Write a protein that binds this DNA or RNA. Structure first.
Lengths: 70, 289, 166, 180
DNA sequence: TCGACGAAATATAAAAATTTAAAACTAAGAGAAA
């Protein structure tokens, strides 16, 4: 869904690479899927990668999301 | 002795090769050529660490290919889980190692004479197979089939022969032995429909099929223009050593990369504990091993 | 081999017919080519007479220019005259062993030899006859695998063959 | 004839001359993928100049993915600056390029089934596995991927003059392997 | 239900960099049998 893409955009804008964190958050993905989405988002959206680089949102979502299902 | 150790290994190779050949249904001289290729492989310091079925499958395939036959790698890999493409990769590795010469051609005319009996059989077995090979012979010279999985083009030609002739058969039942995706199958069928005027499709195709030029392969259409539209001189060839000399490798050249990188090489130390919290939360037992 | 020896020495032919004796060569058969593969040099008191192994012919230009794959096509390393061609590389029944290809092949099959022809004049390379192969085929040896053999008798007989020759 | 191959990918490596550990580097990194259970090597990604060089615990890094030779050495200098600023000296010396990959189109169609049978000494044709023809040239050592579409992968060389020499050497092969 | 596209899997050529078989190759150990 597009909401998952929005959440992944927020996650990549918050911190750097967090492949293990988002892999453990969603127990249906793998390293290949997140690597693939990083590859296809690094090229097609030049403004979004720079915006994530210059934004650096605080991690106010991953710490709370790590406890709801684990 | 040195000669004594060879015999047990050759006996094991013969036993495994005969065991696979008992399910592959190949003649005796093909197995003999495969065993002599296995002897050549052992003479070339046979690849260790490989699975036994891989090397015997490669030798069986090269023996069955040195004389024009019909066997396909899926038949080699038809025991419930074999991962056929690994066998293909091992064969590709053994191409250079064994240094194959006098390479055999890749023509799908012999494929149809073996695919005919299983799917889309005929009462006389003369009509559909000859129609398929006759259309394939002229579709090959149009430079359309080039490195495009000969089993797939054989199945597509069989489907075209069934379409032009009369045969009440299921379209999707052919994937039992052909093992071809429906997407590329219908791509090749409507490619044949595009490249043919369909002048007499309902009765019988044209008996004088000549297409001198006038056609291009689909990959040429995709990436000849390298975009989407909807004998040079040696002086013109510069050496790239000057490109490497342009960047200075001086020990004092540590401040030539100041393009805001110097403020952001690494993570800030104020969030090190914040990272460490979720690190010991998750990435903790991942290091103790 | 013995029957062929004693039949051909039972040992001549028709004079001046050998110029016309080369004939039309069909595409597909392996073709044996002379010393000038890509370089023509002063071979070491040459008695090998064609000096290399066979290749496959795919195309022909004229009656005196045949295309067959030896090297990359740079500087026309593909076609030679028919005076540098031969025809016959057959009977695997009489010659059981195949053609060795790699050095790691050569290390293991090194202790199966017949004769030594001469060192290649370029730098150091040896040219030899192997065992249970036809004498027309030749196998290239270097000094890397030349130290694991009875080679003393090999360069001994090469030395006395040179003494006979010159 | 006048078509020039496009410089597309360069593979190079350097040694920093220190027997360091990479857990210290991984613990302080803005963008770096690392998994200790698999290897001890860290993959790090930077936006510019679009390089994904792989660092090793032996003290050497293999620079890959750079579009230009200047970009490769500049990225290596940036990584040297990073490893200087984190915890180590790790002097940047002994640059070496191992492979250069290029792609270009020839603009006229090429016969390949005839090419497979003709140049089979240097070719390895397998339609069941790979659509293209793998041209394994010996002298000079450049491996080409010939296609019917004309787009040729030109990996194998460590330089650019070698790339140009390989292209002008194999251009007559495609010249006689034309389509009428 | 035919068309329209996205996308991993391979080759590819290197440099690499920890674990995993893994099948030739030796070498006991019994069992024959004139």
């Amino acid at each position: 869904t597009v909401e998952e893409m929005i959440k992944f955009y927020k996650a990549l804008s918050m911190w750097g690479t967090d492949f293990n964190l988002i892999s453990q958050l969603y127990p249906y993905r793998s390293r290949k899927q997140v690597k693939a989405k990083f590859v296809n988002e690094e090229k097609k959206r030049p403004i979004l990668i720079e915006l994530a680089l210059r934004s650096k949102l605080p991690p106010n979502f991953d710490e709370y999301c790590c406890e709801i299902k684990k | 002795s040195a000669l004594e150790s060879r015999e047990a290994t050759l006996n094991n190779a013969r036993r495994k090769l005969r065991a696979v050949s008992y399910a592959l249904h190949i003649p005796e001289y093909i197995t003999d050529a495969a065993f002599q290729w296995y002897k050549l492989a052992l003479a070339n310091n046979f690849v260790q660490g490989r699975r036994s079925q891989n090397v015997i499958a490669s030798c069986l395939y090269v023996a069955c290919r040195k004389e024009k036959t019909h066997h396909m790698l899926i038949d080699f890999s038809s025991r419930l889980q074999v991962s056929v493409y690994s066998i293909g990769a091992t064969f590709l590795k053994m191409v250079k190692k064994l240094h194959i010469t006098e390479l055999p051609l890749a023509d799908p005319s012999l494929f149809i004479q073996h695919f005919a009996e299983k799917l889309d059989l005929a009462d006389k077995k003369i009509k559909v197979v000859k129609d398929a090979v006759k259309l394939a012979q002229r579709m090959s010279k149009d430079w359309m089939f080039e490195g495009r999985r000969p089993a797939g083009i054989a199945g597509a030609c069989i489907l075209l022969a069934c379409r032009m002739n009369n045969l009440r058969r299921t379209h999707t039942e052919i994937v039992a032995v052909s093992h071809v995706a429906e997407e590329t199958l219908q791509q090749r069928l409507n490619e044949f429909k595009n490249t043919k005027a369909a002048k007499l499709s309902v009765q019988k195709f044209r008996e004088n099929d000549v297409e001198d030029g006038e056609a291009r392969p689909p990959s040429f259409v995709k990436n000849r223009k390298k975009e989407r539209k909807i004998p040079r001189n040696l002086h013109l060839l510069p050496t790239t050593d000057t490109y490497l000399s342009k960047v200075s490798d001086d020990p004092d050249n540590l401040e030539d990369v100041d393009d805001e990188e110097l403020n952001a090489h690494l993570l800030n130390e104020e969030a090190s504990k914040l990272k460490e919290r979720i690190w010991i939360g998750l990435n903790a037992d991942f290091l103790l091993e | 081999i013995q029957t062929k020896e004693q039949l051909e020495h039972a040992e001549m032919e028709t004079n001046n017919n050998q110029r016309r004796k080369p004939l039309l060569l069909n595409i597909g058969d392996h073709v044996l080519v002379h010393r000038d593969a890509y370089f023509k040099k002063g071979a070491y008191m040459k008695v090998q007479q064609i000096y290399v192994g066979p290749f496959r012919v795919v195309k022909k230009i004229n009656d005196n220019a045949y295309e067959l794959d030896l090297n990359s096509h740079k500087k026309k390393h593909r076609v030679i005259n028919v005076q540098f061609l031969k025809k016959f590389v057959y009977r695997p029944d009489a010659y059981p062993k195949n053609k060795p290809i790699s050095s790691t092949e050569r290390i293991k099959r090194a202790h199966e030899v017949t004769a030594l022809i001469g060192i290649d004049t370029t730098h150091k390379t040896y040219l030899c006859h192997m065992q249970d192969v036809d004498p027309t085929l030749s196998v290239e040896y270097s000094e890397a695998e030349f130290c694991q053999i009875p080679e003393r008798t090999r360069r001994s007989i090469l030395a006395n063959f040179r003494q006979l020759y010159e | 004839s006048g078509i020039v191959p496009t410089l597309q990918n360069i593979v190079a490596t350097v040694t920093l001359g220190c027997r360091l550990d990479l857990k210290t580097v991984a613990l302080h990194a803005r963008n770096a993928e690392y998994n200790p259970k698999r290897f001890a090597a860290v993959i790090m990604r930077i936006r510019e100049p679009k390089t994904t060089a792989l660092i090793f615990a032996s003290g050497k890094m293999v620079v890959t993915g750079a579009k230009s030779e200047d970009d490769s050495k500049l990225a290596s200098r940036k990584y040297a600056r990073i490893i200087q600023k984190i915890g180590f000296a790790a002097k940047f010396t002994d640059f070496k390029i191992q492979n250069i990959v290029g792609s270009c189109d020839v603009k006229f169609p090429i016969r390949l089934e005839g090419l497979a049978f003709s140049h089979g000494t240097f070719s390895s044709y397998e339609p069941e596995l790979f659509p293209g023809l793998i041209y394994r040239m010996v002298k000079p050592k450049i491996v080409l991927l010939i296609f019917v579409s004309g787009k040729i992968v030109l990996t194998g060389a460590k330089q650019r003059e070698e790339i140009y020499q390989a292209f002008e050497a194999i251009y007559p092969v495609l010249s006689e392997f034309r389509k009428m």
